[PDB]
Design a protein around this ligand. Structure first.
Ligand code: CLA
Ligand code: CLA
Ligand code: CLA
Ligand code: CLA
Ligand code: CLA
Ligand code: CLA
Ligand code: KC2
Ligand code: KC2
Ligand SMILES: CC1=C(C#C/C(C)=C/C=C/C(C)=C/C=C/C=C(C)/C=C/C=C(\C)C#CC2=C(C)C[C@@H](O)CC2(C)C)C(C)(C)C[C@H](O)C1
Ligand SMILES: CC1=C(C#C/C(C)=C/C=C/C(C)=C/C=C/C=C(C)/C=C/C=C(C)/C=C/C2=C(C)CCCC2(C)C)C(C)(C)C[C@H](O)C1
Ligand SMILES: CC1=C(C#C/C(C)=C/C=C/C(C)=C/C=C/C=C(C)/C=C/C=C(C)/C=C/C2=C(C)CCCC2(C)C)C(C)(C)C[C@H](O)C1
Lengths: 192, 65, 34, 34, 172
């Protein structure tokens, strides 16, 4: 609904084959690519709630491996040694950082993360993925928010693939996002 | 039916026969607690079976002293 | 020299009320489920 | 955390993600579809 | 439409009748137990904490001469044995028998939860002043219950009393 040309009916540009039936103009960012009909049995409200949160973690994770090979905060260097991104999920669980990023995130999801899905499942007004966080009102302007909702999800659909790639590439060869772009060859194969 | 002091004392405990909660009620909580109990039973079984060796848990007679 | 009529629970029931103080106080009724 | 405990937790995860999650997904996907 | 959490809906029985209500009942404890019993508890925990926080601070700066000088938490142990502990338990228990009678009254609806009718110095002049203060107490009780838990755990780790730790941060 930013434009029907970008999303929604008539914008199914897979050879259309009609359109996955449950999928329709209403859900944001629908081009109708549902080969496996997941929409068919599924609650697209948990389905739509589930896609945006995976997208937001990944855009945040991805900004992260990229801004971690490129920067480390005051300190970090002395602890953490200087280590690639998966090793951090093994050292951190012991320096304690991560375990105090699962405490507060668990507190986040339990207190607000789980009621909101139940309300969306219950038929409560909030749309899948709406936590009503708009501290600076880019959202306020109604026209721009519609562009943002299509923007938010598309970048998240992109980031989840990129972060999945960053993690896949590094274990096989290289270190991190920046370095893998840095060394093109399978020439050096630094171990994970 | 004989009425007794102890019978009248304990009568409300045996009063709501067939009273049920609607639908599924607390079934997910029961399933979660059963899953935790199953995990606990697996842990203690593998500890006794010596397939799970926690530090300072010597499953042996020599651990008595 | 007041003398109340006390048309109320017999002496034995009062001893029971006093016993119910120690085996049935109202401490846990407050946490009854709804 | 002995290597034995690590094997136990990963065994729980694999059983969840290779046995429980795939089979359960299929039953919900095909039950709802028919 | 909970105000505190815009996303979650207001829990059904948190309607602002009790002051201190921002609709924050995410896990829905309100529905399962009587709200009136819960307010009694909020304030009763808060009241112990709001006092204890003062004590950890005072016990650190000064201790009466007859008692040996000890860190605030250490004392739970000396006092278990000197026998002071029993006295502070006996009395707080005695006050509480009356508290059981008070609660049962709240359940019968004849007492506002948390009201022991103690305003000796008569600070509460008007029904608005009562609402202002009553909110303040509920806010302080909530802050204090968090802080007392902190003073204790930080000592269990730093092994330093709260004011001393602030002076010498001694980061892990
Ligand atoms: C080789 C044949 C072929 C061709 C020519 C196209 C052509 C197109 N596809 Mg693709 N598509 C194909 C096969 C093909 N598709 C197959 C086999 C699938 C899997 C079932 C898809 C799944 C797919 C998705 C999921 C999307 C497209 C979209 C598009 C359109 C791009 C519009 C844009 O900029 O965004 C474009 C017309 C996009 C679209 O229509 O958005 C408007 C889009 O989001 N396609
Ligand atoms: C886990 C993340 C996730 C989730 C929950 C969803 C969920 C959804 N997507 Mg999105 N999508 C994602 C990732 C995700 N997507 C990614 C990464 C891309 C980029 C390729 C897209 C691209 C995309 C397009 C272009 C469209 C959707 C649409 C939809 C909706 C209908 C499809 C459906 O019911 O399947 C639910 C999904 C699942 C049940 C996940 C199953 C995964 C299987 C089991 C394993 C896959 C492994 C893989 C093949 C390797 C639904 C709300 C359509 C829409 O808007 O409809 C409203 C639509 O047009 N998605
Ligand atoms: C999926 C998201 C994600 C995850 C799981 C991690 C996890 C981790 N990061 Mg990364 N990071 C992220 C996003 C993420 N980060 C983003 C978005 C940035 C850019 C600001 C960074 C920048 C960054 C640096 C510079 C460093 C880490 C480091 C670390 C490790 C220690 C935790 C720490 O101090 O973080 C610190 C990270 C932050 C304070 C940024 C979080 C703020 C974002 C905006 C989230 C806010 C959400 C709301 C708006 C840990 C493995 C450290 C490390 O061990 O490196 C070897 C380290 O030096 N991260
Ligand atoms: C591509 C990025 C992107 C985009 C376009 C949006 C867009 C939107 N989000 Mg989403 N969001 C994102 C990333 C994004 N978000 C991430 C990474 C998170 C996790 C931290 C969230 C978490 C989130 C929540 C919890 C909520 C939204 C909401 C919204 C809507 C209103 C807020 C707004 O206009 O912000 C526009 C945002 C931008 C233009 C991004 C700017 C990037 C900043 C400046 C740099 C990074 C932060 C920096 C440290 C400061 C709008 C549709 C709200 C909603 O659905 O209301 C209807 C809502 O409740 N978002
Ligand atoms: C634009 C992207 C891009 C570019 C520039 C290259 C470039 C290269 N690849 Mg390829 N590669 C790519 C994408 C790309 N790849 C992708 C996406 C995959 C996954 C399918 C691979 C999988 C792949 C394999 C499996 C191998 C290469 C190898 C090589 C190098 C061969 C010459 C050499 O050893 O160094 C010459 C200069 C000094 C060369 C630099 C080979 C290599 O490095 O040899 C060990 C090799 O074995 N690549
Ligand atoms: C044990 C102390 C205690 C008790 C009995 C209550 C009781 C109450 N509160 Mg209060 N509250 C407390 C502490 C407490 N609160 C603290 C510390 C804060 C500050 C965060 C608040 C902030 C607060 C607000 C803002 C509001 C209430 C409200 C309420 C009422 C309804 C919510 C409810 O049922 O909560 C039940 C609470 C419990 C059963 C205690 C939690 C026990 C859990 C299961 C254990 C884990 C808790 C843990 C500390 C939190 C996670 C932290 C993580 C690191 C592990 C009820 C009278 C609402 C109200 O006024 O309605 C009348 C309201 O709007 N409370
Ligand atoms: C808000 C920005 C900021 C972030 C996001 C951040 C994250 C982390 C993480 C990741 C979770 C770890 C693991 C970590 C650990 C250490 N930090 Mg900290 N840190 C930040 C700020 C500062 C400043 C300003 C200083 C500092 C210090 C140290 C020392 C030194 C002691 C040593 O010598 O061992 C250690 C070990 C000092 C330093 O050396 O910085 C040059 C110091 O001045 N940090 N820090
Ligand atoms: C879907 C997951 C995924 C995504 C989204 C993704 C994106 C990008 C982008 C962004 C557009 C670039 C620019 C890029 C570049 C390279 N990728 Mg790559 N990539 C992904 C997955 C894999 C796997 C599984 C392998 C791989 C490889 C390489 C090599 C080879 C260098 C070499 O031969 O040494 C180079 C230059 C191989 C490698 O890592 O060798 C161990 C290898 O098997 N990637 N990759
Ligand atoms: C509201 C809400 C929820 C919630 C919540 C929360 C966050 C509840 C948290 C509650 C807390 C933290 C209650 C803390 C009470 C602390 C007390 C009573 C301390 C007493 C100390 C004493 C008596 C002492 C002492 C001492 C003194 C003074 C000095 C020493 O010498 C000796 C000694 C050690 C004896 C959630 C989200 C869960 C769900 C929900 O939907 C709604
Ligand atoms: C911390 C931790 C670790 C970790 C970890 C992590 C973070 C692992 C994360 C891995 C992720 C995110 C993998 C996903 C990769 C993306 C895939 C497979 C999709 C590709 C797209 C495809 C195939 C098609 C797309 C497409 C569609 C749908 C069809 C049409 C066209 C097209 C657009 C191309 C360990 C596990 C390593 C262990 C360590 O001890 C600790
Ligand atoms: C056992 C022991 C003793 C003892 C003892 C004692 C007194 C133990 C008591 C410990 C206490 C009271 C711990 C408190 C934990 C409270 C937490 C984590 C809540 C934080 C608030 C949060 C997370 C707020 C979150 C929030 C924020 C603002 C934003 C989001 C919304 C909201 C959810 C409202 C001794 C000392 C007597 C000695 C003896 O030898 C042994």
């Amino acid at each position: 609904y930013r434009e029907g040309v970008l999303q929604g009916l008539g914008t199914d540009a897979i050879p259309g084959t009609d359109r996955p039936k449950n999928l329709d103009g209403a859900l944001v960012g629908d081009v109708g690519f549902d080969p496996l009909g997941f929409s068919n049995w599924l609650d697209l409200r948990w389905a739509r709630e589930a896609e945006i949160k995976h997208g937001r973690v990944a855009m945040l994770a991805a900004t992260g491996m990229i801004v971690q090979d490129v920067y480390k905060f005051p300190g970090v260097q002395k602890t953490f040694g200087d280590a690639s991104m998966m090793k951090l999920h093994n050292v951190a669980v012991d320096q304690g950082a991560m375990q105090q990023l699962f405490l507060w995130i668990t507190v986040l999801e339990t207190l607000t993360g789980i009621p909101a899905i139940i309300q969306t499942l219950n038929g409560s007004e909030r749309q899948p993925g709406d936590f009503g966080f708009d501290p600076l009102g880019c959202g306020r302007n109604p026209e721009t928010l519609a562009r943002r909702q299509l923007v938010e999800l598309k970048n998240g659909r992109l980031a989840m693939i990129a972060v999945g790639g960053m993690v896949h590439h590094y274990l096989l060869v290289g270190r991190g996002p920046i370095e893998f772009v840095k060394n093109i060859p399978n020439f050096k194969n630094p171990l994970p | 039916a004989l009425r007794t002091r102890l019978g009248e004392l304990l009568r409300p405990l045996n009063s709501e026969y067939g009273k049920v909660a609607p639908g599924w009620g607390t079934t997910p909580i029961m399933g979660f607690v059963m899953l935790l109990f199953a995990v606990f039973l697996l842990i203690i079984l593998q500890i006794y079976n010596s397939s799970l060796i926690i530090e300072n848990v010597d499953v042996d007679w020599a651990s008595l002293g | 020299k007041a003398a109340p009529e006390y048309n109320g629970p017999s002496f034995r029931e009062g001893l029971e009320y006093v016993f119910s103080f120690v085996w049935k106080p109202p401490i846990l009724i407050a946490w009854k489920p709804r | 955390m002995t290597p034995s405990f690590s094997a136990f937790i990963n065994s729980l995860l694999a059983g969840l993600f290779i046995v429980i999650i795939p089979i359960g997904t299929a039953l919900l996907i095909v039950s709802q579809s028919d | 439409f909970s105000a505190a959490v815009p996303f979650l809906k207001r829990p059904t029985n948190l309607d602002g009748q009790y002051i201190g209500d921002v609709g924050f009942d995410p896990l829905g404890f309100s529905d399962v137990f009587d709200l009136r019993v819960l307010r009694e508890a909020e304030l009763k925990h808060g009241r112990f904490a709001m006092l204890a926080t003062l004590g950890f601070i005072v016990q650190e700066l000064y201790t009466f001469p007859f008692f040996p000088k000890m860190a605030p938490v250490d004392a739970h142990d000396y006092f278990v044995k000197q026998g002071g502990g029993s006295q502070i338990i006996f009395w707080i228990s005695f006050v509480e028998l009356f508290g059981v009678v008070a609660l049962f009254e709240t359940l019968q609806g004849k007492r506002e939860p948390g009201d022991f009718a103690f305003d000796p110095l008569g600070l509460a002049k008007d029904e608005a002043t009562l609402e202002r203060y009553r909110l303040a107490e509920v806010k302080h009780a909530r802050l204090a219950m968090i802080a007392i838990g902190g003073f204790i755990h930080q000592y269990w780790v730093t092994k330093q009393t709260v004011l001393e730790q602030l002076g010498n941060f001694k980061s892990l």
